[PDB]
Every structure is written in structure tokens, then in C-alpha cells.
């Protein structure tokens with residue numbers, strides 16, 4: 396029943412660094428702020444990534460989107476029937492997130508998830524990137540995807556698939572990482588039992604052309620943030636590179652051209668070619 400990943404919020408120590416990193420390096424558009432948070436756009440939505448101060452330096456929340464008010468109610472029922480605790484968002488939160496309905500819960504292991512419907516769009520104020528990027532691929536596939544580090548894969552799997560309704564695409568023995576989808580995007584969430592002290596390992600934005608990626612690589616390289624050379628994944632075939640975010644241990648992946656989802660298969664390497672570690 397979850398349709399797609401629509402937005403992400405980070406609680407970071409260096410907001411100045413995050414702002415600069417998101418605009419000048421990644422190419423997102425600054426969209427003001429909501430509360431203590433600075434907002435950034437990637438398309439027509441009023442915002443896609445929120446950055447706020449915090450000693451946490453990690454992903455503070457994930458917005459999971461559904462198509463209408465009724466579907467939101469159906470998620471309410473599903474969560475209750477599955478016995479998962481949740482809370483309705485109040486007027487304050489709803490207008491801070493610019494959504495029309497909002498259920499708040501958390502995955503086991505502690506990641507705050509927000510299920511919403513009716514987001515705000517601003518077409519009269521067309522998106523203008525802060526760095527040279529022709530555009531991002533969002534739409535029905537949502538904002539991108541992230542790799543959630545969890546202590547127990549089977550427990551995380553059951554929740555994401557059984558209650559949230561994600562479906563497995565395939566596995567890669569990196570620790571077997573499990574990739575799940577909830578729309579055409581090969582994966583919106585990947586679950587892996589990595590020994591890092593973080594909620595996620597990385598998030599990924601998909602650009603329209605290979606040049607977008609090439610240009611971004613140079614921008615991030617000049618900043619000294621590259622951690623992975625250009626490459627292409629085995630399972631979704633995304634062509635990308637990885638770079639360090641201003642928050643230690645969390646990284647970004649800028650990619651292009653992934654295939655869309657189907658049959659579960661198993662891969663032994665994450666890279667088809669490339670992706671050499673730097």
C-alpha cells in the first residue's frame with residue numbers, strides 16, 4: 396500500500412555544510428525553511444529533503460507516500476491490525492510537512508517513518524538547480540532510495556513487506572543485502588545488516604543524463620568527497636559514484652539509467668563494472 400518514498404529529513408551537526416553540499420555540489424534548489432528545518436527541492440514538490448540541526452548526524456525521518464485519504468485510512472487499519480503503534484499528525488506537523496494526512500510510526504530498530512498523502516506542489520515557481528544538472532527522475536518513483544542498516548534482516552523484512560507492503564526485488568551478498576520495491580524503481584529500500592553506527596548507509600538521487608553524473612563527479616571530487624569511482628550495479632544497473640556527505644559514515648550516490656522492475660535473483664557482487672573504492 397505504500398506507493399513511494401517522497402521525502403527525507405536529516406538531523407545534522409553542520410547545517411552550513413549540508414546546505415552548501417546540497418546546493419552547490421548535488422545541485423538541489425533551496426526552498427526556504429519550515430520550522431528549524433531548511434528545505435530543498437528536486438522538482439515540483441514544495442520540498443524533498445529537509446535538513447535540521449541535531450547531534451544525531453543521521454536520517455531523522457522518512458516520508459512514505461500514498462495516493463489519497465482513503466489509502467491513508469487503509470494504512471491506519473493495517474498498522475492497527477498488525478499491532479504497530481502509530482499516531483495521527485496534528486495541524487502543527489501537517490503544515491510543517493505540507494501534507495494533508497499524516498500517520499507517524501517507526502520501523503523496529505527505531506527509524507521514524509511518516510506515512511502521508513496530499514503533498515504540496517508549486518508549479519508557479521519552477522525548479523532551478525544550484526549546480527548544472529538537467530534534472531532528477533522522481534515522479535511515480537518517488538525521490539530515490541536508501542540502504543537501511545538493521546540488526547536483524549528477517550525482522551526488518553517482515554515489517555517492510557508484511558505491514559508496509561514492499562516487495563523483494565533481489566539479494567546481493569555484499570552480509571546479504573535485500574532490495575525491496577513498491578513501484579517501478581528497482582528498489583526504494585534496501586535492508587542490510589552492516590556494522591555501521593548509522594540508520595542508513597546512503598541515499599541516492601537519479602539524474603536524467605550521464606553527463607549530469609559526470610559533471611557531479613567532478614564537483615564532488617574537487618571538494619574531496621569521492622569515495623567510489625563511477626560504476627554500474629549488477630542488480631538495478633544504476634550507473635553512479637558515491638561521495639561523502641558532511642555527516643560521517645553516511646554517503647550519497649548520484650546515478651543514472653537504472654532498470655525498472657519480476658523475478659527474485661541472487662548476485663554475488665554489487666558492481667557489474669567500476670565502483671572501485673577510493
Ligand SMILES: [Fe+3]
Nearest residue numbers: 540542599648
Ligand atoms: Fe544504492
